[PDB]
Amino acid sequence: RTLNRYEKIANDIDAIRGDYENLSDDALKHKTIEFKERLEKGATTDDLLVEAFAVVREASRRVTGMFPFKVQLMGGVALHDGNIAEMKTGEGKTLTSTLPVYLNALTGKGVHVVTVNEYLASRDAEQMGKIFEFLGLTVGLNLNSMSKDEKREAYAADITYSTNNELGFDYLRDNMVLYKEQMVQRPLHFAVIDEVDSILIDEARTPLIISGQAAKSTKLYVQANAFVRTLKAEKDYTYDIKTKAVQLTEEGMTKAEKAFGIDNLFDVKHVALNHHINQALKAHVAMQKDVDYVVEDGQVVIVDSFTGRLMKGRRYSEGLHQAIEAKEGLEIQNESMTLATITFQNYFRMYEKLAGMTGTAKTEEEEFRNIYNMQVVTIPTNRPVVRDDRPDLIYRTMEGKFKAVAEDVAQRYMTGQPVLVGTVAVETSELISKLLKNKGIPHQVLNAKNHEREAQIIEEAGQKGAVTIATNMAGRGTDIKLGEGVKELGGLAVVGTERHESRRIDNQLRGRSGRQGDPGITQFYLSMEDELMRRFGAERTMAMLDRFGMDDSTPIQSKMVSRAVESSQKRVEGNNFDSRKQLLQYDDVLRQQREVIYKQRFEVIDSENLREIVENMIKSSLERAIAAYTPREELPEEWKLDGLVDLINTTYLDEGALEKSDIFGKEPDEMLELIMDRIITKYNEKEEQFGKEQMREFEKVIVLRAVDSKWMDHIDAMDQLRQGIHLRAYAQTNPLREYQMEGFAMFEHMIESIEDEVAKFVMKA
Amino acid sequence: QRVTNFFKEVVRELKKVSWPNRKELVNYTAVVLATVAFFTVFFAVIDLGISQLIRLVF
């Protein structure tokens, strides 16, 4: 077993703690100095482990008044080995991210502590930064609003606190620089990841895309808007609700053809008009206003699907954001164009040692073991969980559920107990807010649109008699500390309102109730016309829901609807599993290609003389131009060498240097040496003419511009191939092998294009 | 006459099929004949050796 090793090391840390207590301050900062000296001299980070953890415990007390328990030391040792410490939600997973961060921050290579959003990153960075800046290490905190100089000074600190989005985007913007000293990140060393399930399992379903803006279109967005707005919800389109997909019908296609003057909407001449009618249809009926975006000062701001926060830089792609902006009469902005792309799997798998801690990982041990080779270590709880965890209450309608949840928080407000209601949308939270305005209950609400007052809401949400309504914002890390006299009456009744897409997310909400041995009550109120049941519930049970009746004063007591609820949630888990797995293997293809190009682009950035790189590009393009003429199946003296002399004079040797008598039907090697010697003397003339240093800046600009433009075009061509791939599974093959073979052919055509562009731009200019 | 119209449509459809070229046909036939020859020789050698070993153990 591995657990008994961690208990033996935790007992060793207690033994050393026996001597570590009476050391004065300014004799512990010297202990960090001594640890760096011993780590430089001959030691590793394992031996120092025992001593280092004891040091942090003493430092922790003096800075914070919190002493680490023994299970926090077991979590620190399990995080140091590269494993996933599953400690229960509420059991202090922020001091156990202080022990191995200190131990692996001593060498100087730098530790990235990832969290889910910026409230938790700033929250952890202040307190743990007090602990670390006590001990003589630096702490940086990397946010979205920082300039590149402040980000470069944040990653130059010993410990960096950031979100996962900012780490991914700083990585992708490090490989779009023009100089080596514009990169912000250091070489990647050690990532501790708070809430590993949310980052590596949940939101690794989606990629990080960085896109610059192309030229604007506005005419067809407004035309497709004005068409789709008059379109008769059941007769001219069908909104599939199982997967949120909207299509026209035959009356809809006929009205689309008669409103635009075209004859067939499904030509190849009108792929653009059909694309605009499709995206205006999706933006009109499949996307609702306060659920998955907002309007904020004349702009559409999308609300994050996982965290429920405003993602104020991100925009919907494939022309959907402009269709939403045209839906509400806002100004339509320029179309994007993907520059760089990565996944959270392939980003967190370039990190040389990757750890993590979470509360709800034991469901996903096989996924943490297959993809990342990290094993979930389940760690004890130091105090038993006395959180009263009541079962669900299924109702028949949404208004019955909301009347019942308002009556529950009304009866809990009367005794002074704090309630935290938990929704997922920004409109159901204001629906229950207006259900609690009348009935006269003073509450607070933490939507996506109420992000500025979050700390003052969370500081008050555990006091005697405080009601909070909270979306996904306060459901993953929010630490509601109980007030005065509030533990005695069962502190922080958490009241759910729907079931989420996994068991881990609602186990996290119940975890907001619990909080290390303090009492708490959770309760989930459910409906049968929920979004989860409407989308994913099986078609068999709906007859029985008709059977149950209609008064909705009391919940359903049956095991049929409970089986339906759990089966629908397990279907959402299975769908997300499959989507995650196929995104993983298709970005494994694109990961091999991206690794090749990003490595070689970086080694043409910091190369002090890139003459040999450009010369190999000219030589490879030259031999491909030789073999593209003079075909080796054909016998010589028929090889149409006049076109070869024309092409070489147009592309390499200034229109006069090559004539047909110099080559005259040789074998390709000696004529290749002749053309290569004429190219190398023209290039050496240009090098001694231009200047040794200005030539390198010139051809660095040429090489980087060619690599960047052809790689953008390759990212977009690989996305269109990834669309057509399953149709290739119709003819009985598997489509992943077709994707790998087409991706390799397409990559090599791209690189031949890069070499041809660089050769003709260096030798004809 | 629908049947001769149908066979005219069948020959037009056979024009639209993407048949393999000459190079892929000789490469594939080399792979098929080489795999059958190798596995035939491999299974003959396996059968002879295992039968002789079984006869040696009796």
Partner: protein, 409 residues
């Protein structure tokens, strides 16, 4: 060569081809391991007998798993609706269907082991199992179903850690292991050198014909109007929907031999008669009336199975369901009728090719006086060609994974 040395040069590819050859050796030691409690018979003396099939562990082969798979695939098509919902739900339903195929094939291997044991007893005339009783027959039935279970686990092993699909490699191994005894009979016949050269050039010619028809796709163009397609096109690898010329596979021949040899089995289940003798003479496919009804059944079952496997209505609803459309064709019912017309013409060509392949060896045995255990090019030829090509393509995809060059070199 170059590509074979390329396979040997890489360590991962050579590791998995060596693992595949090891598990094929493991499968091939089992063809000599006899069934216990049968061994005391004329099987050590039979040299009218089996002589091809003989006997062993894995006498079933993987044929219970083939029958289980084709039966549950025909049951998915609106016959047991539970299987339809399991297919429509996703990958968890695919695991449910795979475990159903495993328990279905244990059931089927059991009852076919009973059938084949009593049938080889009756072919031998009784005197092949000493003490013919319930306990020994149940023992050898559990033994043959254990053989099928070990072969299916072996196939899963060699598809997880070896070259290609496992069941296809094991079926191909059975066919090409049957080859050298046929070569032995062909040699021990010799009746000239010109007969061998003409029949071998005809064998290589029909191998080229099978490569030609098996690797031909009618590629319907598909236009997805859910992404911009803006200012980054080349035009080479556009999205398409490939239909094969032979979509059905080789399963038309299993339905045709079932419908051909079931009435002689019924008529011999009854016993000898005059109309029984007429049926047994009529439904032999070495005769022109039987061969005509064999060819008609192959064509009819090729049409039925090509419309089961491609399913134009379900693929048109599947194309409307996510964006795509054929350029020109309105994506509801008109896409279904367009791809149905393409399927009618393409399946006519593929069905005629299948019928000419399946009755080729009786023409070869008549017009080329081979020993009649040869069957040079039945559907064994199609299985051999298919498995050899897809194992080669899987190894080629691993090679192109290892070839990423870069512009610097």
């Amino acid at each position: 060569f170059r590509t074979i040395s390329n396979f040997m040069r890489v360590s991962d590819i050579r590791n998995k081809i060596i693992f595949t050859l090891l598990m094929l050796i493991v499968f091939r030691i089992g063809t000599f391991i006899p069934v216990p409690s049968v061994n005391t018979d004329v099987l050590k003396l039979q040299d009218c007998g089996g002589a091809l099939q003989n006997f062993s562990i894995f006498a079933m082969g993987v044929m219970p798993y083939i029958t289980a798979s084709i039966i549950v695939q025909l049951l998915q098509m609106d016959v047991v609706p539970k299987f339809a919902e399991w297919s429509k739900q996703g990958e968890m339903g695919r695991r449910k269907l795979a475990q159903f195929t495993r328990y279905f094939t244990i059931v089927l291997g059991f009852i076919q082991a009973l059938g084949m044991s009593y049938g080889f007893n009756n072919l031998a005339g009784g005197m092949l199992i000493q003490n013919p009783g319930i306990g020994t027959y149940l023992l050898i039935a559990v033994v043959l179903t254990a053989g099928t279970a070990f072969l299916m686990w072996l196939g899963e092993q060699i598809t997880a850690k070896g070259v290609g699909n496992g069941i296809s490699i094991i079926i191909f191994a059975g066919i090409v292991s049957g080859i050298p005894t046929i070569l032995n009979q062909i040699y021990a016949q010799t009746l000239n050198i010109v007969r061998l050269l003409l029949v071998a050039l005809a064998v290589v010619a029909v191998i080229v014909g099978v490569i030609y028809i098996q690797q031909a796709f009618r590629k319907i163009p598909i236009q997805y109007a859910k992404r911009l397609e803006g200012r980054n096109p080349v035009g080479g690898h556009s999205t398409h929907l490939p239909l094969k010329v032979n979509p059905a596979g080789v399963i038309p021949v299993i339905f045709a031999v079932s419908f051909l040899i079931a009435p002689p089995t019924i008529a011999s289940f009854f016993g000898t008669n005059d109309v029984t003798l007429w049926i047994r003479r009529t439904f032999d496919y070495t005769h022109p009336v039987g061969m005509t009804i064999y060819v008609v059944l192959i064509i009819a079952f090729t049409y039925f199975y090509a419309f089961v496997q491609v399913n134009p209505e379900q693929m048109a609803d599947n194309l409307k369901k996510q964006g795509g459309y054929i350029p020109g064709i309105r994506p509801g019912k008109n896409t279904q009728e367009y791809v149905t017309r393409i399927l009618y013409r393409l399946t006519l060509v593929g069905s005629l090719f299948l019928a000419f392949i399946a009755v080729l060896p009786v023409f070869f045995v008549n017009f080329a006086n081979l020993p009649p255990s040869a069957q040079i090019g039945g559907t064994s030829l199609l299985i051999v060609v298919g498995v050899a090509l897809e194992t080669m393509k899987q190894l080629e995809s691993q090679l192109v994974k290892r070839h990423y060059r870069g512009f610097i070199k």
